[PDB]
Design an enzyme around this catalytic site. Structure first.
Site, PDB file in Angstrom:
ATOM      1  N   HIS A  41       0.815  -1.214   0.000  1.00 42.57           N
ATOM      2  CA  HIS A  41       0.000   0.000   0.000  1.00 42.57           C
ATOM      3  C   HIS A  41       0.842   1.255   0.000  1.00 42.57           C
ATOM      4  CE1 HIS A  41       0.288  -0.883   4.471  1.00 42.57           C
ATOM      5  NE2 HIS A  41       0.565   0.410   4.493  1.00 42.57           N
ATOM      6  N   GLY A 143       2.401   5.229  10.406  1.00 36.49           N
ATOM      7  CA  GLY A 143       3.709   4.999   9.821  1.00 36.49           C
ATOM      8  C   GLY A 143       4.560   3.930  10.491  1.00 36.49           C
ATOM      9  N   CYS A 145       3.849   1.013   9.674  1.00 32.74           N
ATOM     10  CA  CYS A 145       3.842   0.045   8.587  1.00 32.74           C
ATOM     11  C   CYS A 145       5.221  -0.115   7.957  1.00 32.74           C
ATOM     12  CB  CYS A 145       2.740   0.405   7.582  1.00 32.74           C
ATOM     13  SG  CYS A 145       2.642   2.123   6.960  1.00 32.74           S
TER      14      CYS A 145
END
Lengths: 301, 301
Positions: A41, A143, A145
């Site tokens: 993503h 963030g 991720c």
């Protein structure tokens, strides 16, 4: 003595965390050899994340569209590919600090360390377990991720977790490093339900064995029980049912302490029915299920 | 979201852990520039450790008597010295992996990460607080001596703890990196008593503020109270008394949550008198006192 949640030393994994940007999305990546691994993503804008056709979004983008920062930006994306919810950004330079590593799909009950990373920089390290709903109870902000989970056993970093998404529950979902999500989950902003969080019986037991070793012994009972009879009680309180393999791997701990597994299963049974009575086992007033048998053996010896 | 005990990333401190041997005693050392820091009982045999004259024991030994292993043995002891319960082994090579570092005597309440080390190799990392009896509740085995505690804030490793000794309580005592022990303790095998372990009120409060941020709010009460009135209740339950400086540094958290400090002090008061009623705040059934205000601010934002 003592018994705290330990994480592995994180240095080996620190020298692999990079900053990756596609458009205006910045998330963390894992640089190993000449490949930089990140959640897919990264390519999405904010409006796309409802239900996005990633492969169609990836056609829009090319090799130059992805910018891996590292410490200073000298990573040249030589190739790109989408494996099962991750991007693999082939780059020019191979990481000087690549440790011996491997990708590993762990199992429920098994434990790992998480290095939380914002903007490619490591912030902290803590130990997590993979729950049976295939979520983890971590500590991740916006963030986080691209942050990864690992075992460093036997000199070699076993990567098992990349973080992707927090769920409405407040729990964290992610993937192995081949991309596939743990559990039924998907990388969309849709409502997604974790199931019942069965407690990992074999770990509670190991954490109890750990308690006898550290000096806490009040929960030790004069009773015993049976697997089938303990399991009937495990069920009501939504504990995972106990196998003979669980009894096996608790072997060395039963050995060290001089306490048969089923006897500990009878202490646990009473401890589920009459509760802990305000007392504390190893500094907790609840039953802890995020140390494996293996974790206990390693920290007690 | 989430709120777990985090440790700092340990890589910077890993590349400073060495193996040191004097006679047949092997313990861990901290190599920084051309100096290798270790506990001074490295020079002691087993029989000496009852009440040893260290300075007299150090005359027996010379520069060649100390053998710093590192990865492979190439450390040449160019000098030696005994500062206040530590040895400083001036060596030939300056550590290539010396991070920016500093030695820091922390204060009760303040928190640090511990890298547990056996035979010069890092084994695990966990977060600890310096208790008011000046002990820490850690996880240390035999040969954990020489393991260090640190804050890595603002790019710079602040060393604050070297581990020396477990006490009969099962708690851990040690020193700053200038040698002096935290607390009244001494490096002998004599019976040594920690005092009462007052709970760090300002941290319990921050851990509560952290709880409101993560969604747990049942402990929120419609009452308020006074410092003097909260403190009377803190005393019975052997909590540390609350200062205005504690109220100050909880400022940003009261700001984020919209909850005045004293209001949280009134929730805490009820929570001490009527107990937690079987409910859990942030996954614990006890009140957690090992996250500083600063720790909470950093992990929640």
């Amino acid at each position: 003595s003592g018994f705290r949640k330990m994480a592995f030393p994180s240095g080996k994994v620190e020298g692999c965390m990079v900053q990756v940007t596609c458009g205006t999305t910045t998330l963390n990546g894992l640089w190993l050899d000449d490949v930089v691994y990140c959640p897919r993503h990264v390519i999405c804008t904010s409006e796309d994340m409802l239900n996005p056709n990633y492969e169609d979004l990836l056609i829009r983008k090319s090799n130059h569209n992805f910018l891996v920062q590292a410490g200073n930006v000298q990573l040249r994306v030589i190739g790109h590919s989408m494996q099962n919810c991750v991007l693999k950004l082939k780059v020019d330079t191979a990481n000087p600090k690549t440790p011996k590593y491997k990708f590993v799909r762990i199992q429920p009950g098994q434990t790992f360390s998480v290095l939380a990373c914002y903007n490619g920089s490591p912030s902290g390290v803590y130990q997590c377990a993979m729950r049976p709903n295939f979520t983890i109870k971590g500590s991740f902000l916006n963030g986080s991720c691209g942050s990864v989970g690992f075992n460093i056993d036997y000199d070699c970093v076993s990567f098992c977790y990349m973080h992707h998404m927090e769920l409405p529950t407040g729990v964290h979902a992610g993937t192995d490093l081949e991309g596939n999500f743990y559990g039924p989950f998907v990388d969309r902003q849709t409502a997604q339900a974790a199931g019942t969080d069965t407690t990992i019986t074999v770990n509670v037991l190991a954490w109890l064995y750990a308690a006898v070793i550290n000096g806490d012994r009040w929960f030790l009972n004069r009773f015993t029980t049976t697997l089938n009879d303990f399991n009937l009680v495990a069920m009501k309180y939504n504990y995972e049912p106990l196998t003979q393999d669980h009894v096996d791997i608790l072997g060395p701990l039963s050995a060290q302490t001089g306490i048969a597994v089923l006897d500990m299963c009878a202490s646990l049974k009473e401890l589920l029915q009459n509760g802990m009575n305000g007392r504390t086992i190893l500094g907790s007033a609840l039953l802890e299920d995020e140390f494996t048998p293996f974790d206990v053996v390693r920290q007690c010896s």
